[PDB]
């Protein structure tokens, strides 16, 4: 019963809890990770020891974080859980194979730890360039591990976007058109249809460095006629999409976080929002090549990545925005979940506006593999992307486990979380602006200073994560059951009750 | 009709990326020399495309280049 | 639509004759969505409203609502209270600061 | 409450431990801050 | 329920397969660094009997339980078609890395396509026997398809048994092919893109050829009825998209490129 | 009492702060284009009006920074 | 050949609790058994071969 | 290089690096109205007991959105590409310098005239002389000659590296088998200091470039006494 | 059928608080332990 | 001949669903239901198989906003949002 | 009780769809009974009962601010403060020297050769330095 | 929103144990391990 | 129909499969060998294959796959 309710699951609740497991778990994998990042650039000098092992703690922070993280959480942990109940299906389309999307993961996750162990590790970077991540500069097994690691993650999204697609399309009410879905179900969709159509390229570019390394072809090794800067297209066209696809449900979420506590029965301007998405992940499919400004393309191509990449602004502006005007008059509940939707607006802003000034070649030049790039993407993720889950899970939470967290401890967990990022990446725009390079084990003296001060924030932040372990534990063993939801007419997940019944809709919801 | 100081731009490669154009004034100096010797003509003459791949090109390359032609495995047409 | 036929839909709302306590409750709770604190003659037909429905307490609901409609405007309930004066008098209805529910 | 009833002593408590705590470790512990030169060093002959 | 959706069974298939993934996997590492096959060995093993398991009952559940409603054959519909998007966005991975390769032939390949040394296969010799060998087999199909919406059992057996040898007949003369190729998948770029394309092309179609070959068997079992037949219509979608790709590959990696 | 604006309290709040809005962030405007931007543009204009690099160098190439010039 | 589907539906529609991995009969639990145990097995071994290969 | 507690560009040692200082001025007024703007409507959004509840229809709210954010990515976008064409002007170089990235060490070529090769390593902390700047000096360094236009050939002969100067607004990829072109140009004599800016490997952090720049005469002086 | 109700749809049991404390921090202090020890690991080898 | 037709062979859910077609009905819930005037007298009357079903309303067609909540066994309620009526029926 | 209507008390939705108290007692049967004639007749303490019958809390006390934003910035600054203890414990057991180029004798040379060099001479660094007084601006 | 009250209060020495539980146990593994780096140097 | 689709299987794309099979059957003959010549971009072994003596691709064929040593 046990064996079968959580190995052999076919039940959409239950495999989105194994994915919140696994992610949550993931997430202490790579928190610790950046801790050792971060104790290496605390002051002058080198503390681990080799450049070689802090290159590749750098590229597993960045691996766990990514595809063992957030991807697991956003989509198999709350798209599982909340997709089904908010469309009124009694589950996936796929149950069965929902549950290979999740078992895929523990085995992909064994290959990257197996990866850096054997030999000296894969240091190469998480974007795992060739020449350096070839079989004279990287030999041994584990740049292969790695790559066996992305297959079985990409693996696990594609067979994962072919049912979110099919459950979203064809398993909602008969009488309900898409464009009377929640905003979190399209945010799911248009992730689904990116992951379809970026991961068989990453796994197309990954098969062919694998071949390089094991099977005499060359389609990266200049000496045969290759190129290395082919591989780098090659991930890129995945790449660009792979951080949309990090974002739009983060963006879902906090839709429904806004609406809920700004008292509102609906999210400002639907349609907008829904034309936002279904254009920042369009937009998303042609501007790759502003992750490749210095690899010397020509200066028309480069005024293209340039302006394609600077009306990916408008589209994300038209959610900001609707967002703010969903605050506009409502009668605003001050929860933890609000607090962190409230950050999330004004951070990923930030981190959005410095992606806008990396996006102009010119600029980049000088910009290009420093800090800058790293507070860039940090604020987008770090704060964008981690503040979205965490205030859809404080929000979510009592849905999941039929019990409330302490209100003001998740309130003090946002205070110290809150200080911990901006004082760890706020201080690296600086670093970047001055020059400092990306992937350095060790630095000249001048940049001591701010990067001192951003290994002291990573500490607060860690004491966050530490707390936020323990708040779980005690809403756990309080046992506070929750009596009534508020608005239940517009938020369809929670009127089954909390937790919901294994089996919900067996009875389908509407008029036409 | 020289007093070279350095290879100057060439429309034809006018980017970022040169490696054609050393690759080419390389091949160039070669089929020259061999055109010149067979009309009997100065090889003294195709030193403009000596001084711009000597300039252009790593030494590796041209080393690598040189010991190829020797060795009967140069790729390209000369 | 214009402010004089808006106030005359709800008064007429409020003023039929048969009103269930269900629409009563619905048309306060829709009306306070509104930016609007709303006009004296909409909240005395609905106190009358509540009288034809014997519901009291709902009369001194209706009366704090329109206090907190208001906001940072303080001067909105003090006319509002002095122009539904005579229904509340008559009515028998006590504000919600005389009650003690302020 | 909770909060009436020790708020101000957790807000005025827990300030003070923390500008303690942490003026201790920026000035006592030995931590290389670097700052600027400029005021402060006066240069000395290099050769 | 009244709904007409499928509730599966608790099912150990999804871990078997997960686990099988790792095997091979780690038998892929264990081969290429450790000298060794056994991992690579009980991993192909165990993804083959996971997946007769796993297609097994999904025929139990709906010729003999019956779970395919029109609703749960309309997701199944949407999930094909997305699974094949997907194929083809991997393959314009490798178009992509040919048509990177042939149009700017670097020095060491003498700076022209095909790269010095290299003698390609004659377009018109066998490669253009393999192609009207897959057209042809695309024909027979849809005289299949159209046979068995028809109810006529002997002449889509008959068809499709056509389809199959048509797809065999493809398989055994590229191993050919491959076997007298003067060139390797060691040969530079040339070899690189011609073997792990068209490999990967072959792959497909010995998985196409596979999955009719099932469909053969199932309607010789009278699985199919002349209006629900899935996964026949799956069979030949999957085998339209082998003979699409193949045209591609024909008209790049031979014509544009010898 | 006189009867006070019932109507439109939270549009007409937030149409006038809009027009604060823009005043504090075109306050940044005509001002770090002087304090940053103008500050700049004026430091490097006058750093090379009159700027001798040779007697820039000699000074370096006398204090010895160079490895080509002693 | 004959049709004997109607047998077959007959079969997997019985009413004995079972799940349809394990409806066909003693068979079907011979053939899970023996895909468990290679899958826990191989496991087991590729976690020792990590052993071998990380030290 | 950079000094202690640095909060912006190094300044700037080339014309091209001061149009990068201004624009990218412009560029942060442009990223200090929005993201103040931003954070200044969220509290005005948030500091009010008046609500509005009822459906608000995006009529004419939706064309300011897709109309107004347009001429903005228009006013940083016109700059950035004038400066983006500016860097890739006709150059008329009088001298040409290539750099060879390797496993961690540049090595350089001044072959128009006569062979002038060196590789260039990180002077060990250790070896530092008093007064040497930490991680950053070099054995030999990149002479050349101020105001005067040099094309750079940049390439590997491993792995990727990335041959940068922050104060010339200089980055260039060295890709093996690949010759990228970058012209440099110092208005002023002096050391300009850079670093690796591609991982490649154990010793990424520990691959400087520096670059000397002297009059004309000096450069050719030394130009001789290096062969 | 499967329990329903809440700690009864978790692969957990949270019955008592402190068998969780106990097995929370395991799961949770065993995730951030792991890399510390890939990097004794990877010291200690050479 | 020698294929199978659905009438002869379909089995199961699946043969339920085409029967009932065949007859009009749709117990599976495959269509969406036609709405009365929704007025006291002629409430749309919402089938279930036990004492509750959840109704999601679309007040005003171009609604992006579904309006959901539970119909019980009993009298007739209305939309919390546009009041018109919904009664629960047996299946 | 998930299926059913719920109180909620909500400035934006005054009028709840139930009561707040359901299971009438025989004292409070009456109150709602005594609510049938003139409402001049109810005294003060009936029409606060009645009110009470109906909604649980009043306007003012469910808009009532509380003490919780002290408690929750000081336990912030109070689990800030036992970050730097962690900080504290890593520059005693894990932090090693910092490199010689930080003492004294050293950087006051090296700021010496910056200068000398004209290190940001425009804004940056030597700009901020007075070589015709031989001191800092 | 509200909530029922608990069926256990949580006492101050139960938060006690539970709250140290919580940052002890990460710190004691991270703690021996980085501490003793200088000793797995040596060899 | 079907009827138009057995005639296509039997008369038209039959028909180009036995005119193909036979060209290239008629027209084949094992190739002739060319020179063997070091070229550095073909024949690489940036590591040795899994499989024989790791030097031999495979698909080898002896006549006409020169090792990087040139044809055995
Ligand atoms: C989602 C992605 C993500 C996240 C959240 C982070 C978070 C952090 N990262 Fe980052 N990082 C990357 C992705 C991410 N990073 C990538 C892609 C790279 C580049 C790699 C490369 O160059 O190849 C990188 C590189 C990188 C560097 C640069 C290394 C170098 O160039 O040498 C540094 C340096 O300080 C750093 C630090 C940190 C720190 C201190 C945090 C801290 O903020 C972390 C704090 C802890 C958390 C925010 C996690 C909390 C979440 C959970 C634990 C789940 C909880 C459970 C439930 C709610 C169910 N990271
Ligand atoms: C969640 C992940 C995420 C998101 C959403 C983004 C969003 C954006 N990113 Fe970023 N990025 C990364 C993750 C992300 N990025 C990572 C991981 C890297 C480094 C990878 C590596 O190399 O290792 C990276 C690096 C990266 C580069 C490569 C830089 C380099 O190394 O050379 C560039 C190029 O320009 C870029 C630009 C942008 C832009 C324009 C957006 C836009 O979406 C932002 C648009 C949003 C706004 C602009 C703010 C809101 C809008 C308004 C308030 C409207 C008004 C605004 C204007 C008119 C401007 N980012
Ligand atoms: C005739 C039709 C049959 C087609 C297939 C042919 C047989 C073997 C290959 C199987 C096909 C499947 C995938 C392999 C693809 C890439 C390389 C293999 C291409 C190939 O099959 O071509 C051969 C390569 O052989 C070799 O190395 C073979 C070595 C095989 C090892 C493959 C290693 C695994 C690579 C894939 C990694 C897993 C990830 C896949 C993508 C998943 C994405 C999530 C050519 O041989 P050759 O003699 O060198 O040339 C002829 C000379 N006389
Ligand atoms: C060695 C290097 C990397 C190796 C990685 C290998 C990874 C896994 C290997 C093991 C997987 C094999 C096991 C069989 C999987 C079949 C899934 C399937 O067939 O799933 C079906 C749905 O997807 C559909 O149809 C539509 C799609 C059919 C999907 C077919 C699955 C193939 C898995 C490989 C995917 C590669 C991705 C391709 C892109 C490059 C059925 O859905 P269920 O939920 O089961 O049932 C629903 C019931 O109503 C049916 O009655
Ligand atoms: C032996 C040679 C070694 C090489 C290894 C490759 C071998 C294995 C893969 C071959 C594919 C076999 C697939 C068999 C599928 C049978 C099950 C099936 O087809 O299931 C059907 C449902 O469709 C469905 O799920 C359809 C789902 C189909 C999914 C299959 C898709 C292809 C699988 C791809 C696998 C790897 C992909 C490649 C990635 C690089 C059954 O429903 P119906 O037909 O409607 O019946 C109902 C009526 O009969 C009622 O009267
Ligand atoms: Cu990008
Ligand atoms: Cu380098
Ligand atoms: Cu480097
Ligand atoms: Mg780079
Ligand atoms: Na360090
Ligand atoms: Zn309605």
């Known amino acids: 019963m046990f064996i079968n309710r959580w190995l052999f699951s076919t039940n959409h609740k239950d495999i989105g809890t194994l994915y919140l497991l696994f992610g949550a778990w993931a997430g202490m994998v790579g928190t610790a990770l950046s801790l050792l990042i971060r104790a290496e650039l605390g002051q002058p000098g080198t503390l681990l020891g080799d450049d070689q092992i802090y290159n590749v703690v750098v590229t597993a922070h960045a691996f766990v974080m990514i595809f063992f993280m957030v991807m697991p ?259 605003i509940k001050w929860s933890p979940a609000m607090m962190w939707a409230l950050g999330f607006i004004f951070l990923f802003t930030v981190g959005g506006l410095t992606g806008i000034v990396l996006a102009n070649s010119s600029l980049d030049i000088v910009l290009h593999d420093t800090y800058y790039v790293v507070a860039h993407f940090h604020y987008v993720l770090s704060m964008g992307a981690v503040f979205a889950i965490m205030g859809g899970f404080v929000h979510w939470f009592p849905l999941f486990s039929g019990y409330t967290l302490n209100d003001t401890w998740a309130k003090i967990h946002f205070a110290i979380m809150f200080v911990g990022v901006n004082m760890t990446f706020f201080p690296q725009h600086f670093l970047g602006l001055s020059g400092m390079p990306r992937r350095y084990s060790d630095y000249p003296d001048a940049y001591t200073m701010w990067n001192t001060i951003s290994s002291m924030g990573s500490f607060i932040s860690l004491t966050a994560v530490m707390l936020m372990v323990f708040i779980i534990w005690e809403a756990f063993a309080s046992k506070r059951e929750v009596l009534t939801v508020d608005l239940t007419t517009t938020n369809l997940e929670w009127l089954n009750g909390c937790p919901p019944p294994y089996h919900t809709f067996e009875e389908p919801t509407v008029n036409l | 009709i020289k007093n070279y100081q350095t290879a100057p731009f060439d429309s034809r490669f006018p980017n970022q990326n040169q490696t054609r154009n050393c690759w080419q004034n390389y091949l160039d100096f070669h089929r020259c020399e061999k055109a010149m010797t067979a009309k009997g003509g100065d090889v003294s003459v195709c030193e403009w495309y000596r001084r711009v791949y000597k300039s252009l090109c790593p030494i590796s390359w041209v080393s690598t280049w040189d010991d190829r032609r020797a060795e009967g495995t140069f790729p390209g047409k000369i | 639509e214009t402010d004089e036929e808006f106030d005359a839909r709800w008064v007429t709302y409020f003023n039929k004759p048969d009103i269930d306590a269900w629409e009563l409750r619905k048309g306060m709770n829709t009306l306070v969505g509104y930016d609007l604190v709303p006009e004296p003659k909409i909240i005395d037909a609905a106190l009358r409203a509540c009288r034809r429905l014997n519901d009291f307490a709902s009369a001194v609901r209706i ?26 008098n008559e009515l028998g209805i006590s504000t919600p600061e005389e009650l003690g529910l302020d | 409450d909770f909060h009436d009833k020790y708020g101000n002593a957790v807000l005025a408590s827990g300030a003070t431990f923390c500008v303690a705590v942490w003026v201790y470790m920026a000035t006592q512990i030995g931590i290389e801050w670097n700052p600027s030169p400029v005021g402060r060093v006066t240069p000395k002959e290099w050769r | ?243 699409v790709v193949w045209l591609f590959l024909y008209v790049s990696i031979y014509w544009w490129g010898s | 009492l006189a009867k006070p604006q019932m109507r439109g309290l939270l549009a007409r709040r937030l149409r006038f702060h809009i027009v604060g809005a823009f005043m504090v962030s075109l306050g940044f405007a005509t001002f770090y284009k002087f304090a940053v931007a103008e500050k700049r543009k004026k430091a490097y204009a006058d750093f090379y009006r009159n700027y001798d690099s040779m007697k820039d160098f000699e000074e370096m190439r006398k204090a010895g920074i160079f490895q080509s010039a002693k | 050949f004959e049709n004997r589907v109607a047998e077959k539906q007959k079969l997997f529609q019985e009413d004995n609790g079972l799940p349809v991995h394990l409806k066909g009969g003693a068979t079907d639990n011979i053939l899970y058994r023996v895909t468990m145990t290679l899958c826990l097995g191989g496991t087991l071994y590729s976690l020792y071969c990590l052993g071998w290969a990380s030290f | ?167 010339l607004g200089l980055k260039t990829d060295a890709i093996p088998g690949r010759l990228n072109q970058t012209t440099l140009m110092s208005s002023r004599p002096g050391l300009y200091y850079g670093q690796c800016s591609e991982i490649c490997g154990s010793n990424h952090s520990f691959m400087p470039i520096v670059l000397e720049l002297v009059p004309l005469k000096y450069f050719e002086k030394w130009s001789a006494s290096m062969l | 059928h499967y329990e329903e109700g809440p700690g009864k749809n978790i692969p957990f049991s949270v019955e008592n608080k402190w068998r969780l404390l106990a097995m929370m921090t395991l799961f949770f202090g065993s995730g951030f332990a792991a890399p510390f020890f890939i990097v004794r690991h990877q010291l200690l080898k050479k | 001949g020698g294929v199978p037709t659905d009438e002869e062979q379909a089995t199961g859910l699946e043969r339920e669903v085409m029967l009932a077609a065949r007859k009009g009905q749709d117990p599976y819930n495959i269509l969406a239901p036609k709405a009365t005037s929704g007025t006291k007298e002629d409430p749309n009357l919402v089938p279930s198989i036990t004492n509750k079903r959840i109704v999601g309303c679309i007040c005003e067609e171009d609604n992006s906003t579904v309006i959901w909540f539970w119909l019980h066994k009993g009298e007739a309620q209305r939309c919390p949002s546009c009041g018109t009526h919904y009664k629960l029926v047996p299946h | ?94 932090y090693g020297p910092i490199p010689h180029t930080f003492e004294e004798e050293w950087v006051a040379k090296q700021t010496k050769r910056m200068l000398d060099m004209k290190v940001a001479p425009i804004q940056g660094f030597s700009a901020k330095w007075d070589y015709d007084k031989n001191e800092w601006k | 929103i509200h909530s029922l009250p608990p069926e256990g209060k949580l006492g101050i020495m139960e938060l006690a144990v539970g709250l140290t539980s919580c940052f002890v146990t990460f710190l004691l593994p991270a703690g021996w391990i980085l501490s003793h780096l200088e000793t797995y140097r040596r060899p | 129909g079907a009827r138009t689709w057995r005639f296509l299987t039997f008369g038209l794309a039959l028909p180009s499969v036995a005119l193909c099979t036979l060209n290239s059957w008629l027209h084949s003959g094992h190739r002739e060998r060319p020179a063997f010549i070091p070229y550095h971009h073909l024949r690489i072994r940036t590591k040795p294959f899994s499989w024989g003596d790791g030097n031999h691709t495979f698909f080898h064929n002896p006549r006409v796959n020169p090792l990087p040593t040139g044809y055995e």
């Open chain 1, 73 to 331: 959480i956003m989509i198999g942990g709350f798209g599982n859980w909340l997709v089904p109940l908010m469309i009124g299906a009694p589950d996936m389309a796929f149950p069965r194979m929902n549950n290979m999307s999740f078992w895929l993961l523990p085995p992909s996750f064994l290959l990257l730890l197996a990866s850096s162990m054997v030999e000296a590790g894969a240091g190469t970077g998480w974007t795992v360039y060739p020449p350096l991540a070839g079989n004279l500069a990287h030999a041994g097994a584990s740049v292969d591990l790695t790559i066996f690691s992305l297959h079985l993650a990409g693996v696990s999204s594609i067979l994962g976007a072919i049912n979110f697609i099919t459950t979203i399309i064809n398993m909602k009410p008969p009488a309900m058109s898409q464009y009377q879905t929640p905003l979190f179900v399209w945010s799911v969709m248009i992730t689904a249809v990116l992951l379809l159509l970026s991961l068989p390229v990453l796994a197309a570019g990954i098969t062919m460095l694998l071949t390089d390394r094991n099977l005499n072809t060359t389609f990266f090794d200049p000496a045969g006629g290759g190129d290395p800067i082919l591989y780098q297209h090659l991930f890129w066209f995945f790449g660009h999409p792979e951080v949309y696809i990090l974002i739009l449900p983060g963006f879902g979420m906090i839709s429904h976080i806004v609406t809920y506590y700004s008292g509102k029965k609906e999210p400002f301007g639907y349609m907008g929002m829904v034309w936002a998405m279904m254009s920042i992940g369009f937009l998303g499919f042609i501007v790759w090549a502003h992750h490749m400004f210095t690899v010397g393309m020509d200066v028309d191509t480069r005024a293209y990545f340039t302006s394609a990449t600077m009306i990916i602004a408008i589209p994300t502006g038209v959610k900001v925005f609707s967002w703010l005007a969903t605050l506009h008059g409502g009668n």
């Open chain 3, 63 to 88: 009366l704090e609502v329109v206090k907190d409609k208001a906001g940072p405007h303080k001067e909105i309930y003090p006319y509002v209270i002095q122009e539904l004066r005579p229904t509340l």
């Open chain 8, 1 to 167: 290089m950079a000094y202690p507690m640095q909060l912006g560009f190094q300044d700037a040692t080339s014309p091209i690096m001061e149009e990068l200082l201004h624009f990218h001025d412009h560029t942060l007024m442009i990223v200090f109205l929005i993201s103040s703007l931003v954070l200044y409507i969220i509290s005005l959004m948030l500091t009010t007991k008046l609500t509005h509840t009822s459906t608000m229809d995006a009529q004419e709210v939706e064309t300011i959105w897709t109309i107004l954010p347009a001429i903005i990515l228009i006013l940083i976008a016109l700059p950035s590409l004038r400066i983006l064409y500016m860097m890739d002007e006709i150059n008329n170089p009088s001298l040409t310098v290539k750099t060879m990235g390797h496993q961690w060490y540049w090595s350089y070529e001044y072959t128009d005239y006569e062979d002038l090769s060196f590789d260039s390593y990180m002077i060990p902390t250790s070896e530092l002389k008093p007064g040497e700047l930490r991680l950053l000096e070099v054995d030999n360094r990149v002479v050349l000659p101020m105001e005067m236009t040099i094309r750079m050939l940049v390439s590997s002969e491993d792995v990727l590296h990335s041959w940068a100067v922050p104060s």
């Open chain 5, 1 to 243: 329920q009244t709904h007409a959706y499928h509730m599966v069974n608790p099912s150990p298939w999804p871990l078997t397969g997960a686990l099988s993934a790792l095997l091979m996997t780690s038998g892929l590492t264990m081969w290429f660094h450790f000298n060794s096959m056994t991992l690579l060995m009980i991993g192909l093993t165990t993804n083959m009997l996971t997946m007769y398991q796993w297609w097994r009952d999904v025929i139990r559940e709906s010729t003999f339980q019956g779970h395919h409603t029109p609703a749960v054959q309309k997701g199944l519909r949407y999930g094909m078609i997305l699974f094949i998007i997907s194929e083809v966005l991997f393959f314009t991975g490798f178009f992509w890395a040919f048509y990177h390769s042939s149009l700017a032939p670097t020095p060491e390949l003498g700076g022209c396509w095909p790269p010095t040394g290299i003698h390609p296969l004659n377009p018109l010799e066998v490669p253009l026997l393999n192609t009207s060998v897959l057209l042809a087999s695309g024909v027979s199909i849809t005289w299949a398809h159209h046979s068995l919406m028809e109810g006529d059992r002997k002449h889509m057996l008959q068809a499709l048994f056509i389809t199959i040898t048509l797809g065999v007949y493809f398989t055994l003369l590229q191993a050919s092919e491959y076997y007298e190729a003067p060139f390797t998948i060691s040969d530079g770029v040339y070899g690189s893109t011609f073997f792990v394309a068209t490999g990967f092309h072959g792959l497909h179609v010995i998985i196409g050829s596979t999955f009719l070959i099932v469909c053969f068997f199932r309607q010789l079992k009278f699985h199919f009825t002349s209006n629900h037949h899935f996964g026949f219509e799956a069979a030949a979608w999957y085998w339209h998209f082998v003979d």
């Open chain 11, 1 to 94: 009780d998930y299926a059913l209507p719920s109180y909620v008390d909500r400035r934006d939705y005054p009028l709840p769809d139930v009561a707040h108290v359901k299971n009438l007692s025989a004292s409070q049967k009456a109150l709602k009974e005594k609510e049938k004639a003139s409402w001049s007749s109810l005294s003060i303490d009936e029409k606060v009962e009645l009110y009470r019958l109906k909604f649980k809390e009043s306007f003012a006390e469910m808009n009532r601010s509380t003490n919780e934003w002290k408690t929750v910035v000081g336990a912030a600054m109070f689990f800030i403060g036992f970050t730097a203890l962690l900080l504290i414990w890593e520059k005693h057991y894990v």
